[PDB]
RNA sequence: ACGAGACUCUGGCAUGCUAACUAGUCUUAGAGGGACAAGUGGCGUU
């Protein structure tokens, strides 16, 4: 009887409780357009228009954000409430609208789902970094 | 309620051929409200060229040593100035946007010949892809240097890089160099 | 000089002292169908296509 | 001898079926079992509207399942992967109930005792144990044992007296009384091996199934030889009428239904999807279902597309 | 590039002909039935063995190929091998003879045959291709 | 498989003429249990079971006295 | 038969698993799984 399953990208993370309630959306603990970084606001604005209200009228989500770099926890956010929505979807009413609804989603873009897998590779021998070498003098 | 941005949509937007959308191509996933889709265009070939037309004039700017690939300045570039002229217009900067530069493009570059010589080079062309992003390349090298020890700065001229964009008739002027090195090199067709 | 949409059949390779240019052959597709060859600069990738603006660059092989 | 007609399509799922197992004192808890983690629900509705609807999707295995038995009552969902572990579902509070992690070797399978008053699984020390819910032990026999490891033990499907049934891949069969479980007779030098075996449920009769498709079938006293059925490649999924006398399988792409009277396919009727690729090959089929006693019958391949078709038997 | 070392062509070749009847063509199958009848002390090693065993029943399944001699083509292939036909193609009712070999079987106290139709010889000595 | 199939010992044997390096390196045979070989096997080895011997009749018919 | 590969370490992955009163299954580290040129096209005594 614990069906959550959170959002983590990079290094960021998102645990999303997500339950029956009153049915009203909270994000970020904060107004929805008043971010400090101001760099990634309207992108956060694709699925409160794309779904709808009457989509999100029974989800309380309360979620924990924590996470440094504005590419790691925002589009964790992201996939945060497409895997939660999903997943509530799939457990509460059926299979083939939550099919419909993550296709729109997902179809929207790939990036929910996938992180990148690029990390920093250690620094090798006899040079400065992982590839430059030493100035070799003749 | 499939419109594309908040005030495009392609419901309507048809050239009847499957063919010609070599330039703007919007019609699957890889469609972007916003540019910052993140990611990289160097692991592979062919993947900066699978880079969306948009997202590579954007970002392709990014050049010196201290803005080297700093997304954040593309993005909010392209935020800027957009969100204001796309209000103080009102009509469709359509005109300007395709006709000056996505047919300003050349049609030849030029390569090297035989095992020596640097006076001159055969003229071959390239599918118009490569060529017109290595055009789109020289022209953000002149964009910086209209900027550049210049007046008009970065960050307002969201006019040029939608002339820069969008498609089909010529006005440009890196373009016309890249025309006149086209003539030069033709010499030899 | 006409626009001519042509599809590439086969990739030679790189020619050049250290290698600058490339070699492909294009079949037409609705100009009596044949096939040319020619050389092209830059990424030109498995199966494209190819804009001969005007049929009759050749390039020399070897 | 029978007729049958596809009546309809099915589109959209994730996991492929891979064993079948359904109650007839309970026919609201259908199930199918899948290999990316997955279990699908269903619902019988009989409906060129709507044949199908997804309804439930049980997750919370951790490995691939070998096989999945249910109890007398559609009410315990009892599942064992290729690791030694065991799960148990039920019903009244929807969630894991019993985890098993008591089984260090590499089991391939489990199993349910319909009495439930014995446990069998299969290790590899060349042995075979009965447990208890008590966790003491009740019975060992080290002396004449499986050749090879031992694939299950099976009682009756139907409801009836219990009779183990031990079969294995070492093609070796053993059938035994609660009482005494002594070997009786022995025989050796099959051709082909042995997939899975299966308990008929009139108490006379014990098929086979496997590459070779000698369905080999002994008496319930002794070993003797009746009759070895034919067969094509690896059988897997055997099972009577529950009313009648019938024997029915797909080893492979066909159906194969067997009188025991005539022992040879009637008439192969059957329809398949066409292809503009001449190399695209057709996926493969393991499992018949009938609905619940041979009108309506249902298959699953590897095409993300399962196959029902409507059978009138005459 | 992708080249399997002899190891596991060694092993997959030897894996098909011992247990053709066990191994089918789903990666995930070969998989599992090869790590139940081979000891393959890695996993990398045991999945790169499925790989080729695969491959190389989509080799069979469209001919036979000889790096294996499974029983089951090789028996059929016997059996073709005592292929016999209904009538001998030595059973020639008329055979064209010219008359130089007519000839040596009068020679041969071979002449009373009727069967032997006597034909017109080739009137051209052209014979030899051309030199150059 | 160096680490774990072969020892080698490095020893200077002292003569009056000089110093003598013998480097004797041993790779073991694999055997499992009683700890005289690795438990391992050659990482490169693949084994295969061996059936035995089959020359059948054609039907399983039952013989009794 | 060495060498190469395989092999060890290393990062990359779970609406899975073994559980912590310093995090609330995100961190830590597992007897384990996962990729194999595997699926499909095109070149290859195919």
Same mark, same amino acid.
């Given at each position: 009887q614990s069906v959550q399953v959170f959002g983590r990208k990079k290094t960021a993370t998102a645990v999303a409780h997500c339950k029956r309630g009153n049915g009203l959306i909270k994000v970020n603990?904060?107004? #929805?357009?008043?971010?400090?970084?101001?760099?990634? &606001?309207?992108? #956060?604005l694709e699925p409160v228009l794309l779904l709808g209200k009457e989509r999100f009228a029974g989800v309380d989500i309360r979620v924990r954000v924590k996470g440094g770099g504005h590419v790691a926890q925002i589009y964790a956010i992201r996939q945060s409430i497409s895997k939660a929505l999903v997943a509530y979807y799939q457990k509460y009413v059926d299979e083939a609208s939550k099919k419909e609804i993550k296709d729109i989603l997902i179809q929207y873009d790939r990036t929910l789902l996938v992180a990148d897998p690029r990390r920093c590779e250690s620094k090798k021998?006899?040079?400065?970094?992982?590839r430059a070498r030493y100035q070799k003098s003749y | 309620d499939i419109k594309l941005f908040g005030k495009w949509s392609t419901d309507d937007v048809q050239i009847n051929d499957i063919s010609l959308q070599d330039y703007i191509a919007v019609?699957?996933?890889?469609?972007?409200?916003?540019?910052?889709?993140?990611?990289?265009?160097?692991?592979?070939?062919?993947r900066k060229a699978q880079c969306p037309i948009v997202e590579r004039l954007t970002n392709?700017?990014?050049?010196?040593?201290?803005?080297?690939?700093?997304?954040l300045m593309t993005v909010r570039i392209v935020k800027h100035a957009f969100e204001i002229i796309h209000l103080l /217009?009102?009509?469709?900067?359509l005109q300007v946007l395709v006709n000056?530069?996505?047919?300003?493009?050349?049609?030849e570059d030029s390569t090297r010949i035989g095992?020596?010589? /640097?006076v001159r080079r055969q003229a071959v062309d390239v599918s118009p892809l490569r060529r017109v992003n290595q055009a789109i390349w020289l022209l953000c090298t002149g964009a910086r240097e209209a900027a550049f020890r210049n007046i008009? /700065?970065?960050?307002?001229?969201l006019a040029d890089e939608l002339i820069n964009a969008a498609k089909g008739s010529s006005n440009s002027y890196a373009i016309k160099k890249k025309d006149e090195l086209e003539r030069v090199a033709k010499s030899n067709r | 000089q006409p626009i001519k949409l042509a599809r590439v059949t086969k990739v030679l390779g790189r020619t050049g002292s250290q290698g600058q240019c490339t070699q492909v052959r294009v079949e037409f597709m609705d100009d009596t169908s044949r096939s040319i060859i020619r050389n092209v600069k830059g990424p030109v990738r498995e199966g494209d296509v190819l804009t001969l603006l005007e049929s009759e660059r050749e390039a020399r092989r070897l | 001898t029978e007729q049958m007609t596809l009546r309809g399509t099915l589109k959209g799922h994730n996991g492929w079926v891979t064993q079948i197992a359904t109650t007839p004192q309970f026919p609201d808890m259908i199930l199918s079992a899948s290999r990316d983690k997955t279990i699908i629900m269903w619902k019988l509705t009989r409906d060129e509207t709507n044949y199908g609807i997804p309804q439930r999707a049980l997750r919370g295995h951790s490995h691939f399942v070998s096989d999945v038995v249910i109890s007398s009552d559609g009410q315990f969902a009892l599942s064992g992967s290729w690791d030694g572990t065991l799960r148990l579902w039920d019903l009244t509070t929807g969630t894991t109930t019993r985890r098993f992690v008591g089984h260090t070797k590499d089991v391939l399978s489990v199993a349910f005792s319909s009495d439930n008053r014995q446990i069998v699984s299969g290790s590899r020390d060349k042995t075979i144990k009965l447990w208890n819910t008590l966790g003491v032990c009740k019975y060992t026999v &080290?002396?004449?044992?499986?050749?090879?490891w031992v694939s299950c033990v099976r009682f009756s499907p139907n409801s009836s007296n219990p009779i183990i049934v031990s079969c294995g891949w070492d093609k070796l069969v053993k059938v035994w009384n609660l009482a005494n479980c002594k070997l009786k007779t022995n025989h050796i030098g099959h051709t082909g091996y042995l997939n899975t075996v299966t308990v008929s449920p009139d108490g006379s009769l014990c098929a086979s199934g496997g590459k070779?498709? &000698?369905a080999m079938l002994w008496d319930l006293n002794e070993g003797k030889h009746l009759y070895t059925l034919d067969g094509g490649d690896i059988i897997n999924a055997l099972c009577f009428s529950p009313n009648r006398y019938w024997l029915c399988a797909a080893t492979g792409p066909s159906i194969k239904i067997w009188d025991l009277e005539g022992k040879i396919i009637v008439d192969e009727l059957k329809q398949e999807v066409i292809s503009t690729?001449?190399?695209?090959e057709p996926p493969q089929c393991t499992s018949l279902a009938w609905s619940?006693?041979?009108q309506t019958l249902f298959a699953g391949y590897t095409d993300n597309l399962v196959r029902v078709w409507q059978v009138t038997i005459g | 590039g992708r080249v399997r070392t002899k190891t596991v062509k060694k092993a997959a070749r030897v894996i098909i002909e011992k247990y053709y009847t066990r191994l089918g063509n789903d990666f995930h199958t070969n998989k599992r039935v090869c790590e139940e009848i081979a000891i393959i002390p890695s996993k990398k090693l045991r999945n790169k063995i499925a790989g080729y065993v695969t491959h190389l029943m989509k080799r069979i399944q469209r001919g036979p190929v000889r790096g294996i001699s499974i029983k089951l083509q090789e028996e059929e292939r016997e059996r073709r091998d005592n292929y016999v036909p209904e009538?001998?193609? *030595?059973? &020639?009712?008329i055979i064209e003879v010219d008359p130089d070999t007519k000839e040596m079987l009068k020679l041969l106290?071979?002449?009373?045959?009727?069967? #032997?139709? $006597?034909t017109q010889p080739t $009137?051209?000595?052209?014979f030899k291709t051309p030199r150059g | 498989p160096v680490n774990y199939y072969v020892d080698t010992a490095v020893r200077h044997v002292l003569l009056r003429q000089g110093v003598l390096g013998i480097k004797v390196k041993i790779m073991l045979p694999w055997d499992p249990?009683?700890?005289?070989?690795?438990?391992?096997? *050659?990482?490169?080895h693949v084994s295969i079971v061996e059936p035995k011997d089959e020359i059948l009749p054609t039907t399983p018919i039952s013989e009794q006295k």
């Open positions: 603990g904060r107004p #929805l357009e008043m971010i400090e970084p101001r760099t990634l &606001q309207y992108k #956060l021998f006899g040079g400065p970094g992982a | 019609k699957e996933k890889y469609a972007k409200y916003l540019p910052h889709s993140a990611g990289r265009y160097a692991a592979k070939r062919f392709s700017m990014m050049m010196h040593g201290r803005n080297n690939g700093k997304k /217009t009102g009509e469709n900067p000056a530069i996505i047919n300003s493009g050349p049609r095992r020596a010589g /640097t008009k /700065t970065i960050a307002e001229c | - | &080290q002396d004449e044992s499986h050749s090879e070779d498709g &000698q690729s001449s190399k695209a619940a006693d041979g | 009538v001998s193609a *030595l059973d &020639q009712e106290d071979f002449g009373s045959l009727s069967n #032997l139709q $006597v $009137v051209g000595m052209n | 249990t009683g700890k005289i070989g690795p438990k391992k096997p *050659l990482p490169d």
